[PDB]
Amino acid sequence: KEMRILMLGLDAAGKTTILYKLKLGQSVTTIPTVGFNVETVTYKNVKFNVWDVGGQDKIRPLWRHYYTGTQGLIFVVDCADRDRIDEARQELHRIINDREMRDAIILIFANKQDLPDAMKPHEIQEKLGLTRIRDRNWYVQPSCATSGDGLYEGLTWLTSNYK
Amino acid sequence: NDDKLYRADSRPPDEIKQSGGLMPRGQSEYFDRGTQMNINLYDHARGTQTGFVRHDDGYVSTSISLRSAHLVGQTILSGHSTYYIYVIATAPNMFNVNDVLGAYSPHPDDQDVSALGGIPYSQIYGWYRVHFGVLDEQLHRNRGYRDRYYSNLDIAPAADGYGLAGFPPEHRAWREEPWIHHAPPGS
Ligand SMILES: Nc1nc2c(ncn2[C@@H]2O[C@H](COP(=O)(O)OP(=O)(O)OP(=O)(O)O)[C@@H](O)[C@H]2O)c(=O)[nH]1
Ligand SMILES: [Mg+2]
Ligand code: NA
């Protein structure tokens, strides 16, 4: 049981924080990612090969070059960033409409739930237009990457939903 | 999908392993003083006013052949009695500098393929030790190399690097194909 995971999202969403919280079990000081990080993590008998690819606008055209072989997409959203939730929607749907991503299941980490006015999962699901995705499974998992809350719950959903 | 690239570097393999790979100059700068990395491919290629490497450089240069990396070594690392040539798999944070900068590539004889953000240790196939300028030893394989990560990936196509060329704002390239489609406002 291996699954290849691609982890995408706007800059500052918390992708790299997630990758190393899972990998090292620690909260690390990150640099904005301009290329990619990749680690493998084993959980509940599954070896997840997780690709963390930079999300700054100039490098989003590079995301598609990691799609082949992807079995699950993790799309990470900053739930405090209301100003950019619409942009996140647009990027999500661009990813999942690529022919190379058609079969990938989709875990949304509704991240930074610890921040004051943070949008909750129900709001996130509606603002990302997730109900328009009717041909693969998807799930919104609230998370706080810094504390680790929600992260293993998300990996459990991935485990339960790929076959 | 399974070509290799070659990087002359004075840092030994154990140092590279500890750093997590071949990191760009700007990474330590960011951590040490908060400076954002410069991901203008043109600035990486031209370097500093004096022609040196910028402190905030976001890219790591590689060569397209062993012979070429040895030349880099004998030019830039001539002062080092021992250095290494790292053999690296291809991945999509890598750009062919002459292809992205086109005719405006400032040092086209470099034939540089550059990795935006650095090269993870798992992407390193192995290394040649160079002693007194001679490759006298067989390749040493990196046990930490993960071929399944990279064998299905290639370098980024030039079309997806044009937006990263990062010519200065008034530069004429922004009024020409292909960069016109990524031009900054007013350029
Ligand atoms: N308050 C809070 N901050 C978080 C959380 N998760 C990540 N962060 C912070 O958000 C900032 C960006 O986190 P990164 O993990 O670097 O974001 P990224 O998605 O990798 O960004 P790119 O590399 O640009 O693609 C950092 O300062 C993190 O510590 C969270 O759950 N809550
Ligand atoms: Mg990151
Ligand atoms: Na490759």
Side-chain angles (χ1 to χ4, degrees), chain B residues 51-66 68-83:
Chain B
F52 295 100
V53 180
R54 307 177 50 112
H55 297 321
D56 59 4
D57 197 346
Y59 296 88
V60 178
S61 287
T62 79
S63 307
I64 75 177
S65 64
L66 183 50
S68 288
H70 191 190
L71 175 54
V72 167
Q74 283 313 92
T75 308
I76 292 85
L77 311 178
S78 62
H80 294 265
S81 74
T82 302
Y83 60 91

PDB file of all heavy atoms in Angstrom, chain B residues 51-83, unseen atoms left out:
ATOM      1  N   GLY B  51      29.621  40.837 -11.308  1.00  0.00           N
ATOM      2  CA  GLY B  51      29.581  39.501 -11.956  1.00  0.00           C
ATOM      3  C   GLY B  51      29.638  38.268 -11.045  1.00  0.00           C
ATOM      4  O   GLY B  51      29.788  37.136 -11.514  1.00  0.00           O
ATOM      5  N   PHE B  52      29.529  38.461  -9.740  1.00  0.00           N
ATOM      6  CA  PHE B  52      29.564  37.337  -8.820  1.00  0.00           C
ATOM      7  C   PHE B  52      28.150  36.847  -8.559  1.00  0.00           C
ATOM      8  O   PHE B  52      27.183  37.411  -9.069  1.00  0.00           O
ATOM      9  CB  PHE B  52      30.256  37.748  -7.516  1.00  0.00           C
ATOM     10  CG  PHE B  52      31.719  38.086  -7.699  1.00  0.00           C
ATOM     11  CD1 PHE B  52      32.145  39.385  -7.789  1.00  0.00           C
ATOM     12  CD2 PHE B  52      32.637  37.087  -7.826  1.00  0.00           C
ATOM     13  CE1 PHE B  52      33.497  39.667  -7.976  1.00  0.00           C
ATOM     14  CE2 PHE B  52      33.975  37.379  -8.020  1.00  0.00           C
ATOM     15  CZ  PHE B  52      34.387  38.666  -8.098  1.00  0.00           C
ATOM     16  N   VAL B  53      28.059  35.770  -7.778  1.00  0.00           N
ATOM     17  CA  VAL B  53      26.797  35.193  -7.356  1.00  0.00           C
ATOM     18  C   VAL B  53      26.136  36.060  -6.318  1.00  0.00           C
ATOM     19  O   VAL B  53      26.783  36.563  -5.392  1.00  0.00           O
ATOM     20  CB  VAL B  53      27.045  33.777  -6.786  1.00  0.00           C
ATOM     21  CG1 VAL B  53      25.730  33.126  -6.315  1.00  0.00           C
ATOM     22  CG2 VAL B  53      27.672  32.943  -7.836  1.00  0.00           C
ATOM     23  N   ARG B  54      24.846  36.316  -6.516  1.00  0.00           N
ATOM     24  CA  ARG B  54      24.041  37.076  -5.592  1.00  0.00           C
ATOM     25  C   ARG B  54      23.742  36.278  -4.329  1.00  0.00           C
ATOM     26  O   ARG B  54      23.537  35.047  -4.382  1.00  0.00           O
ATOM     27  CB  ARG B  54      22.737  37.447  -6.311  1.00  0.00           C
ATOM     28  CG  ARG B  54      23.018  38.144  -7.649  1.00  0.00           C
ATOM     29  CD  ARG B  54      21.772  38.459  -8.441  1.00  0.00           C
ATOM     30  NE  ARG B  54      20.787  39.129  -7.627  1.00  0.00           N
ATOM     31  CZ  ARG B  54      20.417  40.388  -7.799  1.00  0.00           C
ATOM     32  NH1 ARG B  54      20.938  41.105  -8.787  1.00  0.00           N
ATOM     33  NH2 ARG B  54      19.499  40.913  -7.007  1.00  0.00           N
ATOM     34  N   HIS B  55      23.726  36.971  -3.200  1.00  0.00           N
ATOM     35  CA  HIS B  55      23.509  36.349  -1.883  1.00  0.00           C
ATOM     36  C   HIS B  55      22.130  35.744  -1.735  1.00  0.00           C
ATOM     37  O   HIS B  55      21.921  34.792  -0.967  1.00  0.00           O
ATOM     38  CB  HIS B  55      23.623  37.381  -0.763  1.00  0.00           C
ATOM     39  CG  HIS B  55      24.975  38.000  -0.662  1.00  0.00           C
ATOM     40  ND1 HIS B  55      26.122  37.284  -0.852  1.00  0.00           N
ATOM     41  CD2 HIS B  55      25.359  39.277  -0.410  1.00  0.00           C
ATOM     42  CE1 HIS B  55      27.168  38.083  -0.717  1.00  0.00           C
ATOM     43  NE2 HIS B  55      26.727  39.300  -0.457  1.00  0.00           N
ATOM     44  N   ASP B  56      21.196  36.316  -2.465  1.00  0.00           N
ATOM     45  CA  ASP B  56      19.820  35.885  -2.361  1.00  0.00           C
ATOM     46  C   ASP B  56      19.422  34.987  -3.535  1.00  0.00           C
ATOM     47  O   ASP B  56      18.240  34.805  -3.793  1.00  0.00           O
ATOM     48  CB  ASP B  56      18.906  37.091  -2.282  1.00  0.00           C
ATOM     49  CG  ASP B  56      19.021  37.988  -3.482  1.00  0.00           C
ATOM     50  OD1 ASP B  56      19.744  37.656  -4.418  1.00  0.00           O
ATOM     51  OD2 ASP B  56      18.326  39.041  -3.496  1.00  0.00           O
ATOM     52  N   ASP B  57      20.404  34.433  -4.235  1.00  0.00           N
ATOM     53  CA  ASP B  57      20.114  33.585  -5.387  1.00  0.00           C
ATOM     54  C   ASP B  57      19.219  32.346  -5.025  1.00  0.00           C
ATOM     55  O   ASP B  57      19.541  31.531  -4.157  1.00  0.00           O
ATOM     56  CB  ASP B  57      21.396  33.171  -6.106  1.00  0.00           C
ATOM     57  CG  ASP B  57      21.161  32.638  -7.506  1.00  0.00           C
ATOM     58  OD1 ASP B  57      20.020  32.315  -7.881  1.00  0.00           O
ATOM     59  OD2 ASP B  57      22.180  32.476  -8.252  1.00  0.00           O
ATOM     60  N   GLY B  58      18.068  32.256  -5.695  1.00  0.00           N
ATOM     61  CA  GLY B  58      17.144  31.135  -5.490  1.00  0.00           C
ATOM     62  C   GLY B  58      17.414  29.886  -6.308  1.00  0.00           C
ATOM     63  O   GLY B  58      16.763  28.852  -6.074  1.00  0.00           O
ATOM     64  N   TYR B  59      18.390  29.924  -7.227  1.00  0.00           N
ATOM     65  CA  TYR B  59      18.642  28.819  -8.081  1.00  0.00           C
ATOM     66  C   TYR B  59      20.007  28.140  -7.814  1.00  0.00           C
ATOM     67  O   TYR B  59      20.926  28.826  -7.384  1.00  0.00           O
ATOM     68  CB  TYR B  59      18.699  29.243  -9.533  1.00  0.00           C
ATOM     69  CG  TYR B  59      17.413  29.785 -10.100  1.00  0.00           C
ATOM     70  CD1 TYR B  59      17.123  31.129  -9.977  1.00  0.00           C
ATOM     71  CD2 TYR B  59      16.541  28.976 -10.810  1.00  0.00           C
ATOM     72  CE1 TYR B  59      15.957  31.658 -10.516  1.00  0.00           C
ATOM     73  CE2 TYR B  59      15.362  29.471 -11.357  1.00  0.00           C
ATOM     74  CZ  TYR B  59      15.089  30.807 -11.237  1.00  0.00           C
ATOM     75  OH  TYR B  59      13.900  31.332 -11.776  1.00  0.00           O
ATOM     76  N   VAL B  60      20.090  26.860  -8.159  1.00  0.00           N
ATOM     77  CA  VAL B  60      21.298  26.051  -8.132  1.00  0.00           C
ATOM     78  C   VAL B  60      21.628  25.574  -9.553  1.00  0.00           C
ATOM     79  O   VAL B  60      20.872  24.779 -10.173  1.00  0.00           O
ATOM     80  CB  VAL B  60      21.169  24.802  -7.196  1.00  0.00           C
ATOM     81  CG1 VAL B  60      22.424  23.998  -7.259  1.00  0.00           C
ATOM     82  CG2 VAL B  60      20.816  25.259  -5.783  1.00  0.00           C
ATOM     83  N   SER B  61      22.782  26.009 -10.041  1.00  0.00           N
ATOM     84  CA  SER B  61      23.280  25.647 -11.370  1.00  0.00           C
ATOM     85  C   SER B  61      23.800  24.217 -11.477  1.00  0.00           C
ATOM     86  O   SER B  61      24.474  23.735 -10.572  1.00  0.00           O
ATOM     87  CB  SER B  61      24.431  26.557 -11.743  1.00  0.00           C
ATOM     88  OG  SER B  61      23.985  27.870 -12.071  1.00  0.00           O
ATOM     89  N   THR B  62      23.531  23.595 -12.613  1.00  0.00           N
ATOM     90  CA  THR B  62      24.050  22.266 -12.980  1.00  0.00           C
ATOM     91  C   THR B  62      24.505  22.282 -14.418  1.00  0.00           C
ATOM     92  O   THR B  62      24.169  23.205 -15.190  1.00  0.00           O
ATOM     93  CB  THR B  62      22.989  21.138 -12.796  1.00  0.00           C
ATOM     94  OG1 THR B  62      22.067  21.124 -13.897  1.00  0.00           O
ATOM     95  CG2 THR B  62      22.274  21.195 -11.422  1.00  0.00           C
ATOM     96  N   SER B  63      25.336  21.314 -14.793  1.00  0.00           N
ATOM     97  CA  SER B  63      25.762  21.172 -16.167  1.00  0.00           C
ATOM     98  C   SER B  63      25.025  20.025 -16.873  1.00  0.00           C
ATOM     99  O   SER B  63      24.580  19.058 -16.234  1.00  0.00           O
ATOM    100  CB  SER B  63      27.258  20.868 -16.202  1.00  0.00           C
ATOM    101  OG  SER B  63      28.013  21.802 -15.462  1.00  0.00           O
ATOM    102  N   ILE B  64      25.008  20.046 -18.200  1.00  0.00           N
ATOM    103  CA  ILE B  64      24.351  18.986 -18.944  1.00  0.00           C
ATOM    104  C   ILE B  64      25.236  17.757 -19.277  1.00  0.00           C
ATOM    105  O   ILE B  64      24.746  16.742 -19.788  1.00  0.00           O
ATOM    106  CB  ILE B  64      23.689  19.525 -20.260  1.00  0.00           C
ATOM    107  CG1 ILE B  64      24.745  19.800 -21.314  1.00  0.00           C
ATOM    108  CG2 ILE B  64      22.828  20.713 -19.939  1.00  0.00           C
ATOM    109  CD1 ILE B  64      24.200  20.261 -22.637  1.00  0.00           C
ATOM    110  N   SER B  65      26.537  17.819 -18.977  1.00  0.00           N
ATOM    111  CA  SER B  65      27.391  16.688 -19.192  1.00  0.00           C
ATOM    112  C   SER B  65      28.441  16.643 -18.109  1.00  0.00           C
ATOM    113  O   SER B  65      28.726  17.647 -17.417  1.00  0.00           O
ATOM    114  CB  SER B  65      28.085  16.741 -20.545  1.00  0.00           C
ATOM    115  OG  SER B  65      28.961  17.850 -20.628  1.00  0.00           O
ATOM    116  N   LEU B  66      29.026  15.479 -17.995  1.00  0.00           N
ATOM    117  CA  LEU B  66      30.142  15.261 -17.094  1.00  0.00           C
ATOM    118  C   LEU B  66      31.337  16.162 -17.476  1.00  0.00           C
ATOM    119  O   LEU B  66      31.962  16.756 -16.587  1.00  0.00           O
ATOM    120  CB  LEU B  66      30.535  13.781 -17.085  1.00  0.00           C
ATOM    121  CG  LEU B  66      31.640  13.374 -16.138  1.00  0.00           C
ATOM    122  CD1 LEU B  66      31.445  13.859 -14.777  1.00  0.00           C
ATOM    123  CD2 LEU B  66      31.824  11.856 -16.143  1.00  0.00           C
ATOM    124  N   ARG B  67      31.685  16.189 -18.768  1.00  0.00           N
ATOM    125  CA  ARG B  67      32.792  16.989 -19.315  1.00  0.00           C
ATOM    126  C   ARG B  67      32.543  18.447 -18.919  1.00  0.00           C
ATOM    127  O   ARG B  67      33.441  19.107 -18.495  1.00  0.00           O
ATOM    128  CB  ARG B  67      32.880  16.924 -20.841  1.00  0.00           C
ATOM    129  CG  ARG B  67      34.179  17.611 -21.359  1.00  0.00           C
ATOM    130  CD  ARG B  67      34.335  17.847 -22.929  1.00  0.00           C
ATOM    131  N   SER B  68      31.325  18.927 -19.074  1.00  0.00           N
ATOM    132  CA  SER B  68      31.043  20.330 -18.800  1.00  0.00           C
ATOM    133  C   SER B  68      31.177  20.650 -17.313  1.00  0.00           C
ATOM    134  O   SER B  68      31.674  21.721 -16.921  1.00  0.00           O
ATOM    135  CB  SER B  68      29.632  20.716 -19.297  1.00  0.00           C
ATOM    136  OG  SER B  68      29.677  20.762 -20.736  1.00  0.00           O
ATOM    137  N   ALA B  69      30.663  19.763 -16.465  1.00  0.00           N
ATOM    138  CA  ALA B  69      30.806  19.931 -15.003  1.00  0.00           C
ATOM    139  C   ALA B  69      32.289  19.892 -14.612  1.00  0.00           C
ATOM    140  O   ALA B  69      32.728  20.626 -13.736  1.00  0.00           O
ATOM    141  CB  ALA B  69      30.003  18.852 -14.231  1.00  0.00           C
ATOM    142  N   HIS B  70      33.084  19.071 -15.255  1.00  0.00           N
ATOM    143  CA  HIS B  70      34.516  19.007 -14.945  1.00  0.00           C
ATOM    144  C   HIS B  70      35.162  20.374 -15.311  1.00  0.00           C
ATOM    145  O   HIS B  70      36.089  20.838 -14.664  1.00  0.00           O
ATOM    146  CB  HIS B  70      35.204  17.835 -15.734  1.00  0.00           C
ATOM    147  CG  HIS B  70      36.607  17.508 -15.294  1.00  0.00           C
ATOM    148  ND1 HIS B  70      37.426  16.641 -16.004  1.00  0.00           N
ATOM    149  CD2 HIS B  70      37.314  17.864 -14.189  1.00  0.00           C
ATOM    150  CE1 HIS B  70      38.606  16.572 -15.403  1.00  0.00           C
ATOM    151  NE2 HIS B  70      38.559  17.299 -14.296  1.00  0.00           N
ATOM    152  N   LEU B  71      34.707  20.962 -16.387  1.00  0.00           N
ATOM    153  CA  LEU B  71      35.221  22.292 -16.804  1.00  0.00           C
ATOM    154  C   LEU B  71      34.890  23.401 -15.803  1.00  0.00           C
ATOM    155  O   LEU B  71      35.754  24.215 -15.457  1.00  0.00           O
ATOM    156  CB  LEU B  71      34.626  22.612 -18.141  1.00  0.00           C
ATOM    157  CG  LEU B  71      34.973  23.997 -18.607  1.00  0.00           C
ATOM    158  CD1 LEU B  71      36.417  24.147 -18.576  1.00  0.00           C
ATOM    159  CD2 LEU B  71      34.386  24.226 -20.031  1.00  0.00           C
ATOM    160  N   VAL B  72      33.681  23.333 -15.293  1.00  0.00           N
ATOM    161  CA  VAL B  72      33.182  24.240 -14.217  1.00  0.00           C
ATOM    162  C   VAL B  72      34.104  24.043 -13.020  1.00  0.00           C
ATOM    163  O   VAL B  72      34.591  24.987 -12.426  1.00  0.00           O
ATOM    164  CB  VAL B  72      31.794  23.888 -13.824  1.00  0.00           C
ATOM    165  CG1 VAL B  72      31.410  24.595 -12.501  1.00  0.00           C
ATOM    166  CG2 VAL B  72      30.790  24.218 -14.946  1.00  0.00           C
ATOM    167  N   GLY B  73      34.332  22.787 -12.654  1.00  0.00           N
ATOM    168  CA  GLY B  73      35.225  22.483 -11.567  1.00  0.00           C
ATOM    169  C   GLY B  73      36.622  23.031 -11.788  1.00  0.00           C
ATOM    170  O   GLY B  73      37.284  23.524 -10.846  1.00  0.00           O
ATOM    171  N   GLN B  74      37.141  22.886 -13.008  1.00  0.00           N
ATOM    172  CA  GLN B  74      38.465  23.324 -13.201  1.00  0.00           C
ATOM    173  C   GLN B  74      38.529  24.817 -13.379  1.00  0.00           C
ATOM    174  O   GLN B  74      39.620  25.291 -13.703  1.00  0.00           O
ATOM    175  CB  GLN B  74      39.089  22.763 -14.429  1.00  0.00           C
ATOM    176  CG  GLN B  74      39.526  21.279 -14.252  1.00  0.00           C
ATOM    177  CD  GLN B  74      40.306  20.933 -12.950  1.00  0.00           C
ATOM    178  OE1 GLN B  74      39.718  20.538 -11.917  1.00  0.00           O
ATOM    179  NE2 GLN B  74      41.655  20.933 -13.061  1.00  0.00           N
ATOM    180  N   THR B  75      37.414  25.490 -13.347  1.00  0.00           N
ATOM    181  CA  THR B  75      37.393  26.961 -13.573  1.00  0.00           C
ATOM    182  C   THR B  75      37.090  27.595 -12.219  1.00  0.00           C
ATOM    183  O   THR B  75      37.902  28.305 -11.647  1.00  0.00           O
ATOM    184  CB  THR B  75      36.364  27.390 -14.629  1.00  0.00           C
ATOM    185  OG1 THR B  75      36.512  26.647 -15.848  1.00  0.00           O
ATOM    186  CG2 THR B  75      36.513  28.896 -14.958  1.00  0.00           C
ATOM    187  N   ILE B  76      35.953  27.249 -11.667  1.00  0.00           N
ATOM    188  CA  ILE B  76      35.514  27.841 -10.416  1.00  0.00           C
ATOM    189  C   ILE B  76      36.149  27.242  -9.202  1.00  0.00           C
ATOM    190  O   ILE B  76      36.459  27.988  -8.274  1.00  0.00           O
ATOM    191  CB  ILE B  76      33.966  27.775 -10.338  1.00  0.00           C
ATOM    192  CG1 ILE B  76      33.394  28.706 -11.388  1.00  0.00           C
ATOM    193  CG2 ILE B  76      33.474  28.174  -8.965  1.00  0.00           C
ATOM    194  CD1 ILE B  76      33.260  28.067 -12.778  1.00  0.00           C
ATOM    195  N   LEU B  77      36.397  25.920  -9.190  1.00  0.00           N
ATOM    196  CA  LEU B  77      36.966  25.221  -8.058  1.00  0.00           C
ATOM    197  C   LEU B  77      38.453  24.862  -8.251  1.00  0.00           C
ATOM    198  O   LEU B  77      38.954  23.976  -7.580  1.00  0.00           O
ATOM    199  CB  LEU B  77      36.140  23.949  -7.743  1.00  0.00           C
ATOM    200  CG  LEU B  77      34.605  24.172  -7.648  1.00  0.00           C
ATOM    201  CD1 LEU B  77      33.797  22.922  -7.395  1.00  0.00           C
ATOM    202  CD2 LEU B  77      34.336  25.166  -6.537  1.00  0.00           C
ATOM    203  N   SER B  78      39.155  25.584  -9.146  1.00  0.00           N
ATOM    204  CA  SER B  78      40.589  25.339  -9.409  1.00  0.00           C
ATOM    205  C   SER B  78      41.439  25.399  -8.143  1.00  0.00           C
ATOM    206  O   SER B  78      42.502  24.765  -8.062  1.00  0.00           O
ATOM    207  CB  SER B  78      41.143  26.350 -10.446  1.00  0.00           C
ATOM    208  OG  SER B  78      41.085  27.727 -10.013  1.00  0.00           O
ATOM    209  N   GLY B  79      40.945  26.158  -7.159  1.00  0.00           N
ATOM    210  CA  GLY B  79      41.655  26.387  -5.926  1.00  0.00           C
ATOM    211  C   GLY B  79      41.473  25.291  -4.910  1.00  0.00           C
ATOM    212  O   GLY B  79      42.122  25.329  -3.880  1.00  0.00           O
ATOM    213  N   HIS B  80      40.640  24.287  -5.218  1.00  0.00           N
ATOM    214  CA  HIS B  80      40.333  23.230  -4.271  1.00  0.00           C
ATOM    215  C   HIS B  80      40.988  21.933  -4.709  1.00  0.00           C
ATOM    216  O   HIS B  80      40.691  21.450  -5.791  1.00  0.00           O
ATOM    217  CB  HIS B  80      38.836  22.972  -4.207  1.00  0.00           C
ATOM    218  CG  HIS B  80      38.045  24.100  -3.662  1.00  0.00           C
ATOM    219  ND1 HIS B  80      37.687  24.184  -2.336  1.00  0.00           N
ATOM    220  CD2 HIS B  80      37.576  25.214  -4.254  1.00  0.00           C
ATOM    221  CE1 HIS B  80      37.002  25.299  -2.146  1.00  0.00           C
ATOM    222  NE2 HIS B  80      36.898  25.932  -3.300  1.00  0.00           N
ATOM    223  N   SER B  81      41.847  21.384  -3.869  1.00  0.00           N
ATOM    224  CA  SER B  81      42.512  20.133  -4.143  1.00  0.00           C
ATOM    225  C   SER B  81      41.542  18.958  -4.277  1.00  0.00           C
ATOM    226  O   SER B  81      41.827  17.988  -4.978  1.00  0.00           O
ATOM    227  CB  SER B  81      43.564  19.861  -3.074  1.00  0.00           C
ATOM    228  OG  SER B  81      42.934  19.475  -1.873  1.00  0.00           O
ATOM    229  N   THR B  82      40.391  19.037  -3.616  1.00  0.00           N
ATOM    230  CA  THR B  82      39.346  18.018  -3.767  1.00  0.00           C
ATOM    231  C   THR B  82      38.007  18.665  -3.971  1.00  0.00           C
ATOM    232  O   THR B  82      37.655  19.591  -3.237  1.00  0.00           O
ATOM    233  CB  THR B  82      39.193  17.162  -2.514  1.00  0.00           C
ATOM    234  OG1 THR B  82      40.432  16.546  -2.224  1.00  0.00           O
ATOM    235  CG2 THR B  82      38.101  16.105  -2.706  1.00  0.00           C
ATOM    236  N   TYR B  83      37.234  18.179  -4.940  1.00  0.00           N
ATOM    237  CA  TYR B  83      35.827  18.610  -5.034  1.00  0.00           C
ATOM    238  C   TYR B  83      35.020  17.440  -5.575  1.00  0.00           C
ATOM    239  O   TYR B  83      35.587  16.344  -5.793  1.00  0.00           O
ATOM    240  CB  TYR B  83      35.659  19.890  -5.867  1.00  0.00           C
ATOM    241  CG  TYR B  83      36.116  19.819  -7.313  1.00  0.00           C
ATOM    242  CD1 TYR B  83      35.227  19.453  -8.302  1.00  0.00           C
ATOM    243  CD2 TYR B  83      37.421  20.150  -7.681  1.00  0.00           C
ATOM    244  CE1 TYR B  83      35.600  19.404  -9.641  1.00  0.00           C
ATOM    245  CE2 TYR B  83      37.803  20.135  -9.024  1.00  0.00           C
ATOM    246  CZ  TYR B  83      36.852  19.774 -10.002  1.00  0.00           C
ATOM    247  OH  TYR B  83      37.176  19.705 -11.344  1.00  0.00           O
TER     248      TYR B  83
END
